[PDB]
């Protein structure tokens, strides 16, 4: 299968319970977990990486992991996550135009990788005007866009980055820039954040590698306490709200050459006139690391900056 075309073993320097770094009891639990799912007639997504993500999400409690997997398979089918990429490619023009309309006001882009080879994802929220934003998109539409990105990440970004790093990469490094937002709006979008967390926590286990929140407004940490009840403590332990020294802090995790100049690095686009909010630069754009899955589609249509 496609999995035979890229490393399925994590770096030996990874956390416990990850592919290739299992204890004897974890190996036995994985074998039992798969056996149960197969006997329940499941066939897809039974690979070590996928199954270990669920097992880690439930501390290797096999029955709890079976419940989580069973419910996820249900959701993927009811929500259409299994055909989200195909459906997109069958109505690409219309969908591309929508993303282009929102790109400048709500930058969302991947730009290279972190020191461990994880896709580096950036979001800028300071230019968002809710009134204007909801004239172009709906809340559910934004949620579906995020789910589509989750699928593109697993389908195209994971394989390319794993082949580049020489080992399995299953998580991302995220940087949320809140420069320009008001504490007020942060509280006002809590319901959306809750929807994102619900889908992400329950159906996309162990996908978070690093998560930084920068340029947050005074009092944001207090506002964040409202979000914690929607997140597991493991997830919370991977989210870091940085202050004035964030530039140096980011450089501990990301190569300076990969980090955009405005965030403390020296990274620039081949064409100085291009915009980061139309870019999608990374290993998934390198012929050497693109496999049988094919190259990722250009989410910003003709405006997509791939270099
Ligand atoms: C409409 C505008 C919205 C903007 C504001 C939009 C905010 C959202 C923007 C972008 C979304 C980014 C999503 C990033 C996803 C990263 C990967 C991921 O999905 O990780 C998954 C979780 O993803 C999430 O929880 C998504 C939510 C993360 C925190 C988001 C904080 C947002 C802060 C917003 C601040 C306020 C902004 C205001 C902006 C105002 C602008 C005017 C899995 O986590 P992980 O730890 O790997 O495994 C879990 C497992 O799953 C659980 O089962 C187990 O119990 C537990 O033990 C672990 O095993």
From Swiss-Prot:
CDD domains: SEC14. Residues 98-271 form the CRAL-TRIO domain. Gene3D superfamilies: CRAL-TRIO lipid binding domain, N-terminal domain of phosphatidylinositol transfer protein sec14p. InterPro entries: CRAL-TRIO_dom, CRAL-TRIO_dom_sf, CRAL/TRIO_N_dom, CRAL/TRIO_N_dom_sf, PI/PC_transfer. One of its GO terms (biological process) is post-Golgi vesicle-mediated transport. It holds the Pfam family CRAL_TRIO. Coiled coil: none annotated. Signal peptide: none annotated. GO terms for cellular component: nucleus. Present with 2870 molecules/cell in log phase SD medium. This is CRAL-TRIO domain-containing protein YKL091C. The lineage of its organism: Eukaryota, Fungi, Dikarya, Ascomycota, Saccharomycotina.
């Amino acid at each position: 299968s496609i999995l035979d075309t890229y490393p399925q073993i994590c770096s030996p320097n990874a956390l416990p319970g990850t592919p290739g770094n299992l204890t004897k009891e974890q190996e036995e639990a994985l074998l039992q977990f798969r056996s149960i799912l197969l006997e329940k007639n499941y066939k897809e997504r039974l690979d070590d990486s996928t199954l270990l993500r669920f097992l880690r999400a439930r501390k290797f409690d096999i029955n709890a992991s079976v419940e989580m997997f069973v419910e996820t398979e249900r959701w993927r089918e009811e929500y259409g996550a299994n055909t989200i990429i195909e459906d997109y490619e069958n109505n690409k023009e219309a969908e591309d135009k929508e993303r282009i309309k929102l790109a400048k006001m709500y930058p969302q882009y991947y730009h290279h990788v972190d020191k461990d080879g994880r896709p580096l994802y950036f979001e800028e929220l300071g230019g968002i005007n809710l009134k204007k934003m909801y004239k172009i998109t709906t809340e559910k539409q934004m949620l579906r866009n995020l789910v589509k990105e989750y699928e593109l990440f697993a389908t195209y970004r994971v394989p390319a980055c794993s082949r580049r790093a020489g080992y399995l990469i299953e998580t991302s490094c995220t940087v949320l820039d809140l420069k320009g937002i008001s504490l007020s709006n942060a509280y006002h979008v809590l319901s959306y954040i809750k929807d994102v967390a619900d889908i992400s926590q329950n159906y996309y286990p162990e996908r978070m590698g690093k998560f930084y929140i920068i340029h947050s407004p005074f009092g944001f940490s207090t506002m964040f306490k409202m979000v914690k009840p929607f997140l597991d403590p493991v997830t919370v332990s991977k989210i870091f709200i940085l202050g004035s020294s964030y530039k140096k802090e980011l450089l501990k995790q990301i190569p300076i050459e990969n980090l955009p100049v405005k965030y403390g690095g020296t990274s620039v686009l081949h064409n100085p006139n291009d915009k980061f909010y139309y870019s999608d630069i990374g290993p998934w754009r390198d012929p050497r690391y693109i496999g049988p899955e094919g190259e990722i589609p250009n989410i910003f249509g003709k405006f997509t900056v791939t270099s």
